[PDB]
């Protein structure tokens, strides 16, 4: 009550919670990128110079 509003007690705890979620989301995004079909070029029909149809 000296230098802080009343809502800060809730915000501070919520901020710590939000921080943990953001950290977990960061690792998640990292792993999804290194296993995606764009990074590994999976299910991507690479265009050939002569357009050969198997």
């Amino acid at each position: 009550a000296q230098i802080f509003p009343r809502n800060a007690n809730l915000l501070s705890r919520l901020s710590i919670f939000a921080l943990v979620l953001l950290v977990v989301e960061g690792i998640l995004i990292l792993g999804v990128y290194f296993r995606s079909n764009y990074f590994r070029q999976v299910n991507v029909a690479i265009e050939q110079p002569v357009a050969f149809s198997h």
Binding site: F17, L21, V24, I27, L28, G31, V32, R35
Partner: peptide
């Protein structure tokens, strides 16, 4: 108090399912 303990619990298992999916049955 007891409500937020349940909230931080559901948050944890949510993350685990999420993470386990990515590093196991994802490919």
């Amino acid at each position: 108090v007891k409500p937020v303990f349940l909230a931080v619990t559901l948050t944890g298992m949510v993350a685990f399912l999420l993470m386990v999916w990515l590093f196991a049955f994802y490919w």
